[PDB]
Amino acid sequence: KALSKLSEREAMVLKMRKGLIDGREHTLEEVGAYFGVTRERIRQIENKALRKLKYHESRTRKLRDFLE
Amino acid sequence: SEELEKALSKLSEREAMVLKMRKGLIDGREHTLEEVGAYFGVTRERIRQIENKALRKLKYHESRTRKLRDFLE
DNA sequence: CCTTGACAAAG
DNA sequence: CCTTTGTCAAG
């Protein structure tokens, strides 16, 4: 399950969308096609992966941040 | 798939780290060339150079092997 | 591998 | 009005 960790697919969705795979940013449509899924599911997966990254210590790290 | 992440794995860690940071794959937040510069201790222009090389590597490999485009195109 | 200085845009 | 970002050309 994980509340702060990313699954193989979540990270891949991110790498493909942001251009980490071939230097080209890809549309939700293309990524969905790659995953035999809908462009909307990609968008969803994309969003959940980001929250896992934000929250992931980052959000709660803000108090320790004020001290650096 | 590690298979499609071939070129991305041949980038330097620094190069990879720069892309991840700029794009927000580290903490969900997109960072400025300046913030990344501050991270690695160099100017935003330098980071800009590094980022540019990294992408150039990815596009080049992609245009030579045609991994993703043989599928999309 | 790196920094400067001058800009356009956007804020 | 002044500042931040991302670019460029040189070195």
Side-chain angles (χ1 to χ4, degrees), chain A residues 2 4 6-54 59 61-63 66, chain B residues 2-73:
Chain A
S4 64
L6 296 176
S7 67
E8 164 53 42
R9 197 214 245 163
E10 296 178 313
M12 182 58 168
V13 166
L14 257 45
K15 295 169 185 164
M16 197 167 263
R17 284 280 277 160
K18 312 305 185 188
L20 278 285
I21 296 300
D22 55 2
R24 298 292 175 174
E25 308 195 315
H26 291 284
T27 59
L28 301 166
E29 300 69 32
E30 300 169 307
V31 183
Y34 175 70
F35 286 115
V37 143
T38 228
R39 78 184 192 177
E40 290 79 359
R41 202 189 187 311
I42 296 299
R43 120 248 171 173
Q44 195 175 61
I45 298 177
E46 167 153 44
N47 285 174
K48 190 167 187 169
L50 292 176
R51 297 183 182 186
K52 281 186 178 189
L53 286 177
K54 284 192 177 187
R59 171 194 159 190
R61 273 160 42 193
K62 296 188 177 181
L63 179 54
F66 301 149
Chain B
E2 295 166 295
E3 204 303 303
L4 239 55
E5 291 191 64
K6 284 189 180 180
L8 179 58
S9 291
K10 214 58 178 183
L11 296 183
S12 75
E13 299 170 57
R14 196 201 219 184
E15 287 178 316
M17 180 54 153
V18 168
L19 292 199
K20 291 176 176 178
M21 275 194 240
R22 287 285 281 137
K23 299 301 182 168
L25 297 205
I26 291 294
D27 56 23
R29 279 207 167 200
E30 291 187 318
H31 289 278
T32 56
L33 296 163
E34 182 81 59
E35 276 154 23
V36 174
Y39 181 86
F40 287 104
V42 293
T43 60
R44 68 184 188 287
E45 164 57 18
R46 174 84 275 247
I47 298 291
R48 188 213 135 236
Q49 286 162 12
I50 289 173
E51 177 177 9
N52 257 48
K53 188 175 185 174
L55 268 22
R56 202 100 184 184
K57 287 181 182 187
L58 299 178
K59 289 177 185 174
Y60 178 64
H61 297 315
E62 182 38 40
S63 65
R64 275 260 277 154
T65 67
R66 194 169 202 180
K67 280 190 175 175
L68 258 186
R69 39 225 304 293
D70 270 313
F71 169 63
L72 301 187
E73 313 185 310

